[model samples]
Target chain A: GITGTWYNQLGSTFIVTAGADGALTGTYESAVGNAESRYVLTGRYDSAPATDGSGTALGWTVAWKNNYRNAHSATTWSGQYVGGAEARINTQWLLTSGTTEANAXKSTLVGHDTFTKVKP
Target chain B: GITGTWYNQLGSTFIVTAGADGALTGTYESAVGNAESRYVLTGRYDSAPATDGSGTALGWTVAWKNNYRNAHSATTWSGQYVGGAEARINTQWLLTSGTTEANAXKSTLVGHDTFTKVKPS
Candidate 1:
């Protein structure tokens, strides 16, 4: 279901929930400055078939987008289903000010985050 | 349990398998230059309790350590198990050059990587 609260070692937090239609909605909080900046994210989770045909229950990708730090960031997470409500996702984040959300430079490389299903 | 091959969006690959204990052993390959540098990572994945006690099965942390460059870069991935064979992890990468891994300063944040389990079929 990909729903639940996710946290990093640095205290950053992400709360997410998947709708009945595979619509992904979540919240992110990061301590950038003296305080924390919270942002709302919207995205979709679609089934992605591995090019090599090795997924046990098929694969998926979360096209996640958010405007944290007053800047736009869109990330595509390619994930493989490892069974029992679990998948490992590898995504590259882009940071930019391009109002349209249609882009981001690759060299920026914010960080790659691992997302695990915490709750049903 | 945690034994398998993992991959990233950038084509980076990790061929790993869990040892007898909780030891994590693997290889990392980066396709930066025409040439690739392969590094070995050794660490432990331990069970971590959620302060909220909401573990559909508690949680686990993969304290993965690796050194790709000749200099030195060590990372710690604190993760939580969301049931299934999956867990979310976020860790800061420290790149340093003081011979000992303890002297790395925080000025350098290489990158955070997300992993997915594959194969075993």
Candidate 2:
């Protein structure tokens, strides 16, 4: 269950509440730009065997509010949950930006991160 | 508004149903390795200004069932819906695989695609 506070390498924090039905909704406090803003997140979780039949698979996205007038942008995280002595969530992500059709071309930025559960 | 069929560069297809509350549910047919399997997809959509305050923002994911015995894998598509003469969904994706903690490391394969809506017959 990914129903906890997760922190990533970028110092971003994801606070998630997962339903038994696998619905995911959360808030993301990004450490990148606009650290003052909290973004909305939505995604899903699968308890079943993931892509390689090894672990739980899940994904989520953040719709950047752009209230700071940065750039209209969005990000999606494709992830798998690995459980053990040191539980972690491994993820791949894509960030895309632009406001207009020609301006907002398909994103070229792709990255990966590992998130650890924030302790109580 | 994204209530139609979408085809990607890899011949993969996504059939989407967007709800009023911005919930997204769909089916994805992969053309990469397993063509016989149809995977479940779930995501979100925002009609307001996206990251750059330009377009609509949305995202979805497929949790590979691994029914084909192929490497267990899953993908997430983060997208922006653009409207005009050619309404298209511009997206970025990440595909990750591996079943075990030791076996499944963070994915290195990151990709992008633009999806066009299927026209009504």
Candidate 3:
């Protein structure tokens, strides 16, 4: 079981946790960017569980950046995860916000963090 | 004729009405601060059913903020109506959330209040 807290560039904090099957869970509390002040996310990882020795632990890698171009129209965020020590890293985009010509804008990306028994 | 309830901003309210001439309608229950455990908003506006008199009674005008200093990033609620007064003011920003530096951030804003008619009860 892995539990901790991560902070965004805006000064907001999020609670992170991993299950025995390497699954991830998260919740948004306060954000430092935008203006509103409501909790806006509740999500889970879409991958298998990981093990650090005791059984299985969840782990992941996340990256994000603001896309101010295109009229500051969209923001892009992505991430990846693995199940075991010998598992391959599977990639996935976390979230995308703003408008795109003819599509409903995706405003955020929420998921779990990857963990290993011995830092890789 | 239409009816409903709107609340926001810890505690506040508003109400408007129009007819078949391309007009607009709105409401803001209460919102002038940032906190929790209280009413937020009650919005309803969009397109136009515009009428200077007795025909249609519904309209809209909504935009959100708080994009990082994003003008408090209004929760951005909205609605559009025609022939009547919103069926009941549907488009309502009447509320909102916060944040976004990389992702997973959204704050708050509430909506709806005040009126022209009596409650359904």
Worst 10 residues of 2 chain B by lDDT: B46-55
Which 10 consecutive residues of model 1 chain B have the lowest summed lDDT?
B55-64
Clashes of each: 3, 14, 76
lDDT of 1 by residue, A1-120 (tens): 356665544555566675553344556556423233655443333323223423211111111222223222222222222334444332323221212112212212344544444422
Residue A50 miss distance in model 2 (angstroms): 7.3
| Chain A: TM-score in each model | 0.52, 0.79, 0.35
DockQ of each: 0.02, 0.40, 0.02
Q: What is the overall TM-score of model 3 with all chains considered together?
A: 0.24
- Global lDDT of each candidate: 0.35, 0.70, 0.28
lDDT of 1 at B77: 30
Ranking by lDDT: 2, 1, 3
Error of 1 at A85 (Å): 53
Point out where model 2 deviates above 4 Å: A19-22, A31-36, A50-53, A66-71, A104-108, B31-36, B50-55, B66-71, B105-108, B119-121
Q: Which candidate number would show the highest lDDT if scored against the true structure? A: 2
- Candidate 1 has a TM-score of 0.33
Name model 1 segments beyond 4 Å from true: A1-120, B32-35, B47-69, B80-92, B97-107, B118-121
